[PDB]
Model the fold of this input.
Amino acid sequence: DDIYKTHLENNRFGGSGSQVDSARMNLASSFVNGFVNQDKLLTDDGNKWLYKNKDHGMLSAAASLGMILLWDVDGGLTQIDKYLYSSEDYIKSGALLACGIVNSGVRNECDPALALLSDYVLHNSNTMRLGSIFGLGLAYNREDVLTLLLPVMGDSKSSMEVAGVTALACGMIAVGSCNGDVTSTILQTIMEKSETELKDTYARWLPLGLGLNHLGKGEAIEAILAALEVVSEPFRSFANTLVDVCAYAGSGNVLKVQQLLHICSEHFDSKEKEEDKDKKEKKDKDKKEAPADMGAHQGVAVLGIALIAMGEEIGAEMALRTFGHLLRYGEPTLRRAVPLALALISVSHDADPEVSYNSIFAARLAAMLRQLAQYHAKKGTLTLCPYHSDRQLMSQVAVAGLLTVLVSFL
Amino acid sequence: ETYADIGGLDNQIQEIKESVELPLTHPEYYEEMGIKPPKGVILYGPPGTGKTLLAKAVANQTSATFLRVVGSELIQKYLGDGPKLVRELFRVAEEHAPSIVFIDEIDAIGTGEREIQRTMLELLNQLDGFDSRGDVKVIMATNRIETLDPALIRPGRIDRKIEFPLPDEKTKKRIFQIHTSRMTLADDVTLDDLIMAKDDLSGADIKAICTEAGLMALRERRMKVTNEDFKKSKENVLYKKQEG
Amino acid sequence: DPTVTMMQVEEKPDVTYSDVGGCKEQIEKLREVVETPLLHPERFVNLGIEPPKGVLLFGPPGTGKTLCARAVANRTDACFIRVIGSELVQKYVGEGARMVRELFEMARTKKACLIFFDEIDADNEVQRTMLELINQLDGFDPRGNIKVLMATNRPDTLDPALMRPGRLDRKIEFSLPDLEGRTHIFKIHARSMSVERDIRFELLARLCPNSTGAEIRSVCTEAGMFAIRARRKIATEKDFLEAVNKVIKSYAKFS
Done:
């Protein structure tokens, strides 16, 4: 049905695949390539395209062949088998990630990767644990993988993405539970979370999976228990306000609106970002009240709060009206954050804002992300989790290996 | 009031449709030719009044930025600043490229007076594209095609010109059919004497008597159109333009 | 910098010499004055007194805006400066002297650049521009050997009856339409959008007798407008033949 009724042109692969350079626009070309699944020319345009890329570019480009092949379950083995058990660790780890992305019900690639699992310091099965635990988490209260995930959370590797895809893996596995659970999973990751107050990025992405497990509304007592035990120094208090973010999927609770306005003037410059960012999730249905006066404030990230609060809707004239002002900014965080929502909110008026980006720019992140918007132009938790976890992109390029595997993009 | 609502001139409206909807829209048959005559069509009409001409220019209002510079009224009611207002409209039209510049009721030479010639010659110089290219289209409309001087013809029309036929109660029949497509009224209302009541009129004062026919008919708290209240309200329009 | 300064510089080489047809004698008489004096400066100084100044091009429009284009294309890659006649007669008079002196100053910056005045056919506000225009072109202050040529439609004869016997000479006509001359203008219109070469150019050139350059320019212009109107891929006369005979006959009625 997709191949027959549609006929895409090759000038996007040739052009958008031709003006790429600096090893980052080439990452944008691995994004355009990976999110293409008709034509499979740029997919098989010679070799060395993955070798010229970087390590995290070898992860994203190794997973690109998996992202282009979410079909044809019979041929997936004979297509991904080329990069399996190769000489490079990132090629085989991104190849197991590819095997986790191509399908979600085969579950036959678990044993060759999840079987050994014995590294304990650095060995390859940690990145293969990223691709296999993350890809299997996308494929999936099953204990046949959580019992193996207990030494994963108990290991606490210096690599952030280990507990990243582990907390997000068990979180996406635990969404939709009957009134949630306060078992030794979130209790274990909370005790081991507060065990070492180092590398606060753990204290940022662990509340992601925590809030994912907090699903199960119906006045559950998980918010009160977390409000009793979790209240501590403002890191686990930021975890607490993250539980407040994921705990308000939506009801008649205007106390959260007067409390939102009361706590909106807090000195902490992150609970405003997340707690005020919850506006796009709480009132996501009644879009008549979603536009507010957040743009008139003076906060350093409130324009980002409204900019992300725009979302991925049909993109009416009011939304594009907000993108007309949010598009012109001086900091690379807002100029890098505006094309994602600008192109996600509009899927002869689509490429014109991109021409406006050409008028503004003509750095590396703005060009790679503006090409990401060049191809992005054309209540389920699976469509609410990836960007809420993506709200921490203002860090090292290590996250860019997880930036291209967002499953919410249809 | 869309391009497909009116009848009797579907070819004349698909000519301006297919003519001014050519740039920036439907690019598979626009970039292969490589002509781009950035001059636009020129409309006119003996009835004029902006109703028929607006009904022809409404084709651009489907999907485009709304921008219409109707007549040179703001040029003559303001101080003699000259063409700088047209330069501001042309630079905001440059910042609003996906638009179509429409001009209705051209009353420059039809109605100080010596400045109209220099702002019209400079208007011709800036309209021809002295320092511009095919960014925005320009559609000129007025009450008479003969009001345009021969200066505004050769460098002011290089794209296409049209001819508007006499109303012959078919444009009036379709306009009255549109005005009766939403309201509830039987065939008891004579059409000929009301579309030709004073001397001739396509849509303007029949839209006026439709407005004061819905309001005046609403005064009686009945949605039906009485055979004496419609003409009783028509006597005001017939008497107004004839007494003074 | 005003718009006349940024637009005054000529670029994008337009119609070339390939349109040599019909009036070949006068186009040579005006080609040997724009090409030869600048390309061969030594044997014209050693040849005698001075090289030819220029000619005059009045009368019927015909193939206007194509011969000056030919003079722009056949340039020696040192582009010259041209002036349009619409800038002379404008509002707020008095700036014409500053303009005619600043373009001569730019000619001094461009090592005695050639100055051309197009469409001179566009009352003291005019008398100062023509008397000072003679006092600048016929004056030896900027230069007396760069370029003098007035290609226009109407001469607007105010004082040529006594200002013609002098530095300006060679009273000739502009051009004239012939039967076999239009095929060259069609051959340079082949440089436009790809037209199927199966259609012979003489077949299209022999069905429009006594057609000036503007009429065939309206053939290849209105044929292009009605070609892009037809929403097609290639241009073939079997589709816009009604546009051709309509544009030559409906315009041949009055012109």
